[PDB]
Design a protein around this motif. Structure first.
Motif, short mmCIF file in Angstrom:
data_model
loop_
_atom_site.label_atom_id
_atom_site.label_comp_id
_atom_site.label_asym_id
_atom_site.label_seq_id
_atom_site.Cartn_x
_atom_site.Cartn_y
_atom_site.Cartn_z
N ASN A 127 0.88 -1.19 0.00
CA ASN A 127 -0.12 -0.17 0.11
C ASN A 127 0.89 1.22 0.06
OD1 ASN A 127 -2.26 1.64 2.25
ND2 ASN A 127 -2.50 1.35 0.18
N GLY A 128 2.05 1.30 -0.72
CA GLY A 128 2.61 2.41 -0.88
C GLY A 128 3.88 2.63 0.04
N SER A 129 3.85 1.54 1.50
CA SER A 129 4.87 1.89 2.31
C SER A 129 5.71 0.65 2.53
CB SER A 129 4.07 2.17 3.49
OG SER A 129 3.41 3.51 3.73
N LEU A 130 7.09 0.95 2.93
CA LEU A 130 7.95 0.07 3.36
C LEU A 130 7.79 -0.13 4.87
CD1 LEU A 130 10.42 -1.85 2.98
CD2 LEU A 130 11.85 0.02 3.29
N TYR A 131 7.52 -1.43 5.16
CA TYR A 131 7.37 -1.92 6.42
C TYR A 131 8.48 -2.50 7.06
CZ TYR A 131 2.62 -0.67 6.16
OH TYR A 131 1.44 -0.02 5.74
N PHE A 132 9.46 -1.81 7.91
CA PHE A 132 10.57 -2.73 8.34
C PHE A 132 10.86 -2.65 9.79
CE2 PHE A 132 13.68 0.53 8.94
CZ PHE A 132 12.98 1.76 8.60
N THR A 158 10.57 -2.39 17.03
CA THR A 158 9.93 -1.36 16.50
C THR A 158 9.62 -1.77 14.89
OG1 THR A 158 10.83 0.28 17.99
CG2 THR A 158 9.70 0.91 16.02
N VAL A 159 8.54 -1.84 14.71
CA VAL A 159 7.97 -1.80 13.24
C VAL A 159 7.90 -0.45 12.72
CG1 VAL A 159 6.42 -2.44 11.44
CG2 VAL A 159 7.48 -4.10 12.94
N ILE A 160 8.44 -0.15 11.57
CA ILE A 160 8.44 1.60 11.02
C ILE A 160 7.69 1.34 9.62
CG2 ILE A 160 9.56 3.35 10.47
CD1 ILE A 160 12.03 2.61 12.00
N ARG A 161 6.67 2.13 9.53
CA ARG A 161 5.95 2.29 8.30
C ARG A 161 6.37 3.56 7.39
NH1 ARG A 161 -0.03 4.96 7.06
NH2 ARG A 161 0.23 4.88 4.69
N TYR A 162 6.97 3.10 6.41
CA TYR A 162 8.12 4.49 5.76
C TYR A 162 7.35 4.39 4.51
CZ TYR A 162 11.98 6.36 2.94
OH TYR A 162 12.65 6.98 2.35
N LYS A 175 5.16 7.25 8.65
CA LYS A 175 3.85 7.53 8.97
C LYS A 175 3.22 6.88 10.16
CE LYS A 175 2.09 9.15 4.94
NZ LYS A 175 2.15 10.56 4.62
N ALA A 176 4.10 5.84 10.80
CA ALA A 176 3.61 5.02 11.83
C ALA A 176 4.86 4.45 12.35
CB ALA A 176 2.45 4.13 11.63
N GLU A 177 4.91 4.18 13.69
CA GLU A 177 5.84 3.55 14.63
C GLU A 177 5.38 2.77 15.71
OE1 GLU A 177 8.89 5.84 16.05
OE2 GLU A 177 9.92 5.98 13.87
N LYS A 178 5.54 1.46 15.73
CA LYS A 178 4.81 0.79 16.79
C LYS A 178 5.88 -0.60 17.25
CE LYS A 178 0.58 1.25 17.93
NZ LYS A 178 0.19 0.62 19.42
N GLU A 179 5.84 -0.74 18.54
CA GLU A 179 6.54 -1.96 19.21
C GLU A 179 5.77 -3.15 19.02
OE1 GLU A 179 9.82 -1.03 21.24
OE2 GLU A 179 9.51 0.34 19.59
N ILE A 180 6.16 -4.11 18.40
CA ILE A 180 5.23 -5.47 18.40
C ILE A 180 5.38 -6.03 19.87
CG2 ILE A 180 5.26 -7.77 17.40
CD1 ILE A 180 4.92 -5.20 15.56
N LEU A 201 1.48 -15.00 15.62
CA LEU A 201 1.08 -14.14 14.47
C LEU A 201 0.07 -13.15 15.00
CD1 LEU A 201 -0.13 -16.92 11.99
CD2 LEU A 201 2.25 -16.17 12.71
N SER A 202 0.39 -11.83 14.75
CA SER A 202 -0.41 -10.76 14.66
C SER A 202 -0.81 -10.07 13.49
CB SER A 202 0.24 -9.78 15.55
OG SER A 202 0.25 -10.14 16.84
N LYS A 203 -2.23 -9.93 13.24
CA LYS A 203 -2.74 -9.04 12.40
C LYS A 203 -2.85 -7.61 12.67
CE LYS A 203 -4.77 -8.78 7.99
NZ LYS A 203 -6.31 -8.71 8.02
N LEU A 204 -2.09 -7.01 11.55
CA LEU A 204 -1.86 -5.46 11.93
C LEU A 204 -2.59 -4.36 10.87
CD1 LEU A 204 2.26 -5.46 12.00
CD2 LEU A 204 0.56 -5.57 13.86
N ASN A 205 -3.01 -3.31 11.71
CA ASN A 205 -3.80 -2.24 10.92
C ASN A 205 -2.48 -1.59 10.07
OD1 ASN A 205 -4.35 0.49 10.20
ND2 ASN A 205 -5.94 0.40 11.58
N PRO A 206 -2.57 -1.68 8.68
CA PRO A 206 -1.49 -1.28 7.60
C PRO A 206 -1.09 0.19 8.14
CG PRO A 206 -3.24 -1.91 6.64
CD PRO A 206 -3.57 -2.24 7.70
N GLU A 207 -2.15 1.13 8.38
CA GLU A 207 -1.95 2.43 8.41
C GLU A 207 -1.32 2.99 9.77
OE1 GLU A 207 -5.96 3.57 7.48
OE2 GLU A 207 -5.55 3.02 5.19
N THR A 208 -2.08 2.39 11.02
CA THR A 208 -1.47 2.90 12.33
C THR A 208 -0.37 1.79 13.01
OG1 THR A 208 -3.42 1.42 13.39
CG2 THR A 208 -3.93 3.97 12.64
N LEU A 209 -0.56 0.60 12.44
CA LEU A 209 0.25 -0.48 13.10
C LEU A 209 -0.24 -0.96 14.30
CD1 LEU A 209 4.05 0.41 12.33
CD2 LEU A 209 2.27 -0.99 10.95
#
Ligand code: CA
Ligand code: NA
Length: 260
Positions: A88-93, A100-104, A112-117, A160-168
């Protein structure tokens, strides 16, 4: 059209890394591309080394197979291991030395979003069998964005966790009974987690499937070939219905067959 995995093809080599840092990496396309990108756009990240920051972008697949990027992105934080995906236009790494997962966002080149798993092991705690700090593995399937990891709560079994791709935001979590460090990698197809038994062995197989729809695991024995004997990255692309992998300096795809 979804279904069960029943067959994996021989690996097909698209590009051979000539760089000194290309033994391990991640390469991918966007299963749900956004303007101005297309389903032909390709991204490449060599991940051997420290302070991994460069992401190569190729508008055209020809540019990708010839190794001349149309743009180079410098990541806002150093990257870790091979688990990243584009969606969806973002790199998740994963940020280096963190959970921390980062939405770039690739177009604006901003976070656009940063979240600790939550509770996720990191930096060699619950890696895949070859190590390489592969504790956290993002995945895209027909249903959206997932993360594959483990926790002390899960005693090292794959979570396994399902993530909101916009807010993480973590939307739902499943705890399997499969030890993460016992498998070489994993990927998700149609809400089912699949694991690969070995990253080097000639007799490797897809050996387990965990169905999130039912919460149960089953045995599998589907041959899986590691042609170059060091498969550091295995992910599934739901738009092309192929596996993407990075095997000992070779960016490869695998054809698959699904059932019902
Ligand atoms: Ca994977
Ligand atoms: Na991944």
């Amino acid at each position: 059209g979804c279904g069960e995995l029943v067959w994996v093809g021989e690996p097909v080599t698209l590009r051979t890394a000539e760089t000194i840092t290309g033994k391990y990496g991640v390469w991918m396309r966007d299963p749900k591309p956004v303007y101005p990108y297309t389903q032909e756009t390709t991204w490449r990240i060599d991940t051997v080394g420290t302070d991994v920051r460069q992401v190569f972008e190729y508008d055209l697949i020809s540019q990708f197979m010839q190794g001349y990027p149309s743009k180079v992105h410098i990541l806002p934080r150093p990257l870790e291991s091979t688990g990243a995906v584009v969606y969806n236009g973002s790199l998740y790494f994963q940020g280096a030395g963190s959970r921390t997962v980062i939405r770039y966002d690739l177009k604006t080149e901003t976070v656009k979003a940063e979240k600790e798993i939550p509770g996720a092991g990191y930096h060699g705690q619950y890696p895949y069998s070859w190590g390489g700090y592969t504790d956290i593995d993002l995945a895209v399937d027909e249903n959206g964005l997932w993360v594959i990891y483990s926790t002390n709560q899960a005693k090292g079994n794959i979570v396994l966790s399902k993530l909101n791709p916009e807010t993480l935001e973590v939307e739902q979590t499943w705890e399997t009974n499969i030890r993460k460090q016992s498998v070489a990698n994993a990927f998700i197809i149609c809400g089912t987690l699949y694991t690969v038994s070995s990253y080097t062995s000639a007799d490797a197989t897809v050996n387990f499937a965990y169905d999130t729809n039912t919460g149960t695991s089953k045995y599998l024995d589907i041959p899986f070939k590691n042609r170059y004997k060091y498969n550091s990255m295995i992910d599934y692309n739901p738009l092309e219905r192929k596996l993407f992998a990075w095997d000992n300096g070779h960016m490869v795809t695998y054809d698959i067959k699904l059932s019902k």
